[PDB]
Amino acid sequence: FTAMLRAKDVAGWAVILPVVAWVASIFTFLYSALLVSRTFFGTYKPHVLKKEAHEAPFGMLIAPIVLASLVVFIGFVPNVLSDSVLAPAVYAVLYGLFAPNEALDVHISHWHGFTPELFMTIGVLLFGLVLYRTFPKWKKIYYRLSERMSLNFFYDQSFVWMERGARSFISRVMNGSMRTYLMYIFTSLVALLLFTIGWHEQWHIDLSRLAHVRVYEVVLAIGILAATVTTVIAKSRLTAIV
Amino acid sequence: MELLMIVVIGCLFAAATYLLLSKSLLRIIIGTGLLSHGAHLLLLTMGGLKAGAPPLLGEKASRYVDPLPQALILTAIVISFGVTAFFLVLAYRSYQEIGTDHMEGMK
Amino acid sequence: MSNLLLLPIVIPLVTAIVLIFFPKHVFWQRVVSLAATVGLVVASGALLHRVHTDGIQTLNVGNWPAPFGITLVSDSLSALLVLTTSIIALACLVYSFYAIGHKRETFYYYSFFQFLIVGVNGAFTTGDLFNLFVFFEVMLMSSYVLLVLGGTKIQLRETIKYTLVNVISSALFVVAVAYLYAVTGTLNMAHLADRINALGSSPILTVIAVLFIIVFGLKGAIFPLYFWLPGAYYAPPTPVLALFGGLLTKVGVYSILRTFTLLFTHDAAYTHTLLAWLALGTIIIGVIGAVAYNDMRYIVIYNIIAAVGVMIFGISIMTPESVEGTIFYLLQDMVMKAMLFLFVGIIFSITRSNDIRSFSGLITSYPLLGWAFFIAALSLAGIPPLSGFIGKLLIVKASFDAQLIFEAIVILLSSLLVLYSVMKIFMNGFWGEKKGFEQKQVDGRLFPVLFLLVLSVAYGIGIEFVRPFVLDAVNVLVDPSMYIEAVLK
Amino acid sequence: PTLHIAMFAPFLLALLVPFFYKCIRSLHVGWFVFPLPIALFVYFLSYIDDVRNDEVIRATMPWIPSLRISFDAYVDGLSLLFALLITGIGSLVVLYSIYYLQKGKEPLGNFYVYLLLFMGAMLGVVLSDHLIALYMFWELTSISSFLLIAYWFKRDRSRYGAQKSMLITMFGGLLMLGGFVALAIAGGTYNIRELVHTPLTEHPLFIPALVLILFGAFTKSAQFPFYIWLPDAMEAPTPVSAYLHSATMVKAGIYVIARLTPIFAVSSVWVWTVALVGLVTLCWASFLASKQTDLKAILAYSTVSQLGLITSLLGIGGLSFHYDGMGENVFMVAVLAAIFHLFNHATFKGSLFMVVGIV
Ligand SMILES: CCCCCCCCCCCCCCCCCCCC(=O)O[C@H](COC(=O)CCCCCCCCCCCCCC)COP(=O)(O)OCCN
Ligand SMILES: [K+]
Ligand SMILES: [K+]
Structure with a gap:
């Protein structure tokens, strides 16, 4: 809260930013309180549960004890782990910027002093207390507004859309008939070659290489044109073969 | 003379393309044959068709017809004959075991 | 000595020929094809070390000079592709030993295998467009027969489809070679590269470059020329399919790469x-x-x-x-x-x-x-x-x-x-x-x-x-002056 | 150099796990996993004296020297904070998993192989100075966590959760790779400690690198709207949930933001994007955490909320770089707050998951 309140002093719209973060802390307290208050409190159920004795073994409990002890140790003693570890992390993240280094040190050594963020935490505590006791009253409204916006719905339907669109694409363009694929290949050939010719200007048509035409090739060309025409318009297949 | 050969190989290409896009398989193999003839005549035409002696050094003429495209055409002819004979026996096998000629009906 | 460059081509070829004599003896088919494939791997590795140690390897087939005969050129990229082909061929062959049944390999299966690897190995090392054409049809003909072998209904249908497509693309490569011979007048890679770079400001060369794109994209499936490949590769058996997916579509990529790093440089x-x-x-x-x-x-x-x-x-x-x-x-x-x-x-x-x-x-x-x-x-x-x-x-x-x-x-x-x-x-x-x-x-x-x-x-x-190896390959691909000064001496 | 055999020791022990697992049938295999994080933890206590008096630890192992790629290691205060967190909570989670799982009913060698791969990958993420090495360790983290979420593969919801977490984190990691490449072109080099001492705002690839790195770092640490995978990753075993979704993987994007802050926080897009999306996911997860009816979903939304708090404080600490009015220098406090709560969060969050696992 100290970092967020001193960040709204550079832009006006950033005044929106801490109070939103403030209600986040409200929400935080709620589930955490609800966690403990619906895990260990209440009453015991001797009909659905399994064991008559629920004493856990100690070896399972070793590592949570060590983690909770480290929690309590950096709780009551915050100075030595800060000065050992946390300061060169800040000098690493903010490289090339520390022309002095004593202000960071005297802020690490700072722990107490009356801050305006203290009553902010007190208000967090009081509002979470008055919000948790009435939680079975605004329960249905919260359930329906939580149903009102999620993000697994969008992702699941996006994958259904993607697989169905790809499958319908390959059901459209891959029919299996060889005539259609020949049409695609021939059309692509024609389009690429005609666009490549039309993009240029095709200068220098020189007819000087051309040979003198003679009568025998003319008559034989008319003959094989006749054979070509009678092999494309033939009704029977023997006519096309011959 | 090369212009007339160009328009007649273009008519062979149009005929071959129209036969390849048909419904029966024997028409497709006929189109394969016509496309091969068009390609071989195109090799001969683009090699040049100016008048000279046949490519034989026994005849002592001044200028000869180009020897390279004839050798290239003969290579292409024997390769195309091998592939054409294989594809015709393949069509015979398909008529024998499947039992149809309709190319669109082949699914 | 200098014929090492032909050892990826000659070794399977001879082997395919000697597998014709004994079809019914499946054990000796397996032994001879296995030994020749291992020797192919060793010879391709020796070729890769040879092209790494001293320069790019060129061999005129006859003793005829560089424009006027067939030249075979192995640079570092072709040697890497040949070694990769050799490894894939060996793995597919041992899987073929375990996978293909008895009846399919009494009928000349390993011969067709060796002809397919002849086709791809010859396609990666050549210096002529029309020789590259001939190796494409060796490769494609062996792939037709390996696709159809066995004679069930599915591979009959998609062999008809695959054969039709590759016939059309073969004719298109013929007409592309015809157009380019009319423009340039030569047929080997280096000298027609020099002739294209002597008249590089002409639009017909751009049209023929687009035509080679269409042909080689029919070979190795590009959009919108890909449409034959799903059913055609859904047809064949498994080691044949591993050969097809490992080798066939990637020689079209090599042809596009050689075409646009060597031949067509102006108006890029x-x-x-x-x-x-x-x-x-x-x-x-x-x-x-x-x-x-x-x-x-x-x-x-x-x-x-x-x-x-x-x-x-x-x-x-x-x-x-x-x-x-x-x-x-x-x-x-x-x-x-x-x-x-x-x-x-x-x-x-x-x-x-x-x-x-x-x-x-x-x-x-x-x-x-x-x-x-x-x-x-x-x-x-x-x-x-x-x-x-x-x-x-x-x-x-x-x-x-x-x-x-x-x-x-x-x-x-x-x-x-x-x-x-x-x-x-x-x-x-x-x-x-x-x-x-x-x-x-x-x-x-x-x-x-x-x-x-x-x-x-x-x-x-x-x-x-x-x-x-890849660094020397890049040094010869982005500089074709070394290619055209190695061949044309 | 003695730290080369520290970064790559969990991988070697993960090789050696199934040997001890099917050759020693009496003793529980987790005990054999137990000393190594302890050892690493003790080794990571050995650097605090050298890091307090502003000295760093550099090491280099070249991998592709002609493409200029190495496994570098740079050790300063931030990397030591994260490494001490990783190794300490790793040893405690190994102990809790010894006493938690069973012997003749659970495949245990798979469990400790996946966990130790994850630990080595996370220690590689933190200690790395090279961008491609950082991306490599990042991806290994993602794959090992994908394996750990679906530990019971015979149940459907574990496979759904593993698939969703895989797709989201791989999406973020690939765009992170794109941002790393754009940043490495924008600067002259690949190492992070030389990108700081060069100007980068006069280059067209600065803003796309910023957006792509920032996108990936928001994707890893379960920000808005990418917090979706973390409540469905609760079908893991409870030590996996504790360790991964308390202390190690959900703080990787936090590390990347705090690590590249001296480069990208000279612009306003970085600092305001980070701050605003942190506040948004803080309030959104704090609202949603009270709806759930089981313990682990509550703790998952809790984790998302405190991560949003930490990254919003990182955004204000990015605002610290521009100017401070007349030596006030207040924004630096935010950095300390973030790091403090960072350390703080890890500790108690681990304990909470262990608690619910017990009950
Ligand atoms: C002129 C050619 C010069 C070169 C010489 C070449 C000579 C050989 C040519 C190829 C020969 C192939 C022989 C195959 C077998 C033929 C006989 C059996 C089949 C048959 O009779 O089919 C009928 C023939 O077509 C018909 O009845 C109509 C056929 C029409 C063919 C027209 C060809 C075009 C020529 C144009 C000029 C070219 C000039 C070239 C110099 C189809 O009829 P159906 O179904 O009723 O069968 C009756 C069923 N009981
Ligand atoms: K042809
Ligand atoms: K012909």
């Missing part, structure tokens, strides 16, 4: 923006097909199409970083697609079904196969300790350096989608409870797949070993 803007848009369309079609299907063979087919699109986009930039990246991605993608088809074949052998939704629970019975497929999938995607990382990394770096932000983002999202497809196979097939299959002990055929996987992992680790 139009041809390169055409290659860029066709590559983006190819990537989009591949990832749509990979997302769409719940069938393993179709998933690997559309991963082939997507990887071809990525390689063509790497070709479409004339920077040495992009050329280096597409060479790395080319080698690893050949090996990886052959590996994945062999995986799909083993899984089909176990499940007796190809539908992902039909079976579940294979980790509980086949742990080595499951974690091998997991590592293969993550190496396909491009995770950095694995094989296919440095290629797409250099492609993305060269696209950002030339200010193509959107295309690099398309590449990264395509990597995401191909990962999603193969991991869909892994998560629905291997994980889950056991319902779909019956316990069947696999044998033998798992080991060539594991050999390919170990070579892919060792490739991803040792980029520093495999890199100076």
